[PDB]
Amino acid sequence: GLFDIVKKVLKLLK
């Protein structure tokens, strides 16, 4: 699910 991939990105964005 994309909701676990966005969680990898939000951890890098902030």
CA 4 to the chain's CA centroid: 6
Amino acid at position 2, single letter? L
Written as six digits, the tokens of 6 are 């966005």
Element (H, E) at 1: none
Report d(CA 11, CA 4) in Å as an integer: 11
CB contact set of 12 (below 8 Å; sequence gap of 6+): none
Amino acid at position 13, single letter? L
**Solving technique:** NMR
For the chain, how big is the Rg over CA atoms in Å?
7
Per-residue CA distances from 2 to 7, 14 (Å): 9, 18
